[PDB]
Design a protein around this ligand. Structure first.
Ligand code: HBA
Ligand code: CL
Ligand code: CL
Ligand code: CL
Ligand code: CL
Ligand code: CL
Ligand code: CL
Ligand code: CL
Ligand code: CL
Ligand code: K
Ligand code: K
Ligand code: ZN
Length: 315
């Protein structure tokens, strides 16, 4: 007897594709790699309980290729497997509301993700892939498992791998509309003179070398190709926020002078991130953990600042 059930395949979990599957063959024999809300059913034969459910598959016809690219903005053939493999884990994570923000209870070295997710909720940023727009909306309401799985997939990180917040923010910014952001810098060398540079997009909102936005406006010392020390300072800035990053160092965070910041304790390959947010006082969010203080000092590695338009007075 040949038995069949009706199921739906998908790449974006919105547009469904009707399939009648033979229950005597695995999903893999019929669709290739097949996933049920994260679980790999490629080697499973259809159950009766599967009738009417949706399965993710690879984009193995033109319709699915277009649906997949329009939704995810990637054509990495390995994305689906990485996304599903992460989602199996992030579905089991907990997403507490901490001081009104969606956080992540610690698991699987996910501190860098919690700090990034907390940061996102405090800066103005619109994602370009509908997949991130949709999942981020749900993350803000507290159901962040799909968003975290997507971030892991876009960043090419596996669950358990310790990521870097700055790197993660860079990936997130690459998938956001920052076309309006503009930065103008001046570099002054006593030997070589002045050199002005204009940066746009992601490069206009990220800096590596100093944590202080004020010091960046005043001027920072950097090597010149002639061997001497040159001074670089901020000429103009058009963006809704800036990110200042630096190798972890003892740094003093003052209430009201910044938006939020990343603290990193440990060494290059192994450590722990914490998040500091400046509200009515200074709150330190460490996954599900929350403490408060009037002053904060610790190994800070990223600081976020609000911005709209800045123009130097340095002549
Ligand atoms: O390219 C991303 C992608 C995501 C889910 C799929 O089912 C297939 C492709
Ligand atoms: Cl089976
Ligand atoms: Cl709350
Ligand atoms: Cl968005
Ligand atoms: Cl969730
Ligand atoms: Cl990383
Ligand atoms: Cl994008
Ligand atoms: Cl950009
Ligand atoms: Cl600020
Ligand atoms: K962009
Ligand atoms: K662009
Ligand atoms: Zn020089």
């Amino acid at each position: 007897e040949v038995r069949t059930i009706k199921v739906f395949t998908t790449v974006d979990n919105i547009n469904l594709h009707t399939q009648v599957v033979d229950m005597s063959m695995t999903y893999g024999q019929q669709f290739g790699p097949t996933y049920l809300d994260g679980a790999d059913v490629t080697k499973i034969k259809p159950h009766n309980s599967h009738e009417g459910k949706t399965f993710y598959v690879l984009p193995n016809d033109d319709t699915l290729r277009v649906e997949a690219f329009e939704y995810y903005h990637t054509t990495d053939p390995s994305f689906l497997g990485r996304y599903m493999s992460a989602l199996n884990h992030t579905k089991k994570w907990k997403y507490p509301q901490v001081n009104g923000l969606t956080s992540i209870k610690w698991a699987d070295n996910n501190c860098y993700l919690a700090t990034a997710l907390l940061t996102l909720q405090q800066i103005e940023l619109k994602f370009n892939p509908p997949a991130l727009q949709d999942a981020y909306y749900r993350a803000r309401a507290g159901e962040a498992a799909n968003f975290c799985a997507l971030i892991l997939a876009y960043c090419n990180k596996t669950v358990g791998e310790l990521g870097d917040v700055r790197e993660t923010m860079s990936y997130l910014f690459q998938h956001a509309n920052l076309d309006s952001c503009k930065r103008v810098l001046n570099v002054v060398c006593k030997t070589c003179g002045q050199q002005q540079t204009t940066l746009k997009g992601v490069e206009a909102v990220m800096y590596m070398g100093t944590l202080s936005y004020e010091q960046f406006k005043k001027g920072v010392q950097i090597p010149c190709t002639c061997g001497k020390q040159a001074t670089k300072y901020l000429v103009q800035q058009e963006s809704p926020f800036v990110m200042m990053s630096a190798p972890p160092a003892q740094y003093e965070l003052k209430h009201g002078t910044f938006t939020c910041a990343s603290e990193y304790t440990g060494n290059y390959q192994c450590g722990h991130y914490k998040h500091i947010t400046s509200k009515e006082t200074l709150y330190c969010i460490d996954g599900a953990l929350l403490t408060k203080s009037s002053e904060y000092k610790g190994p800070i590695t990223d600081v976020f600042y609000k911005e709209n338009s800045y123009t130097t007075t340095i002549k």
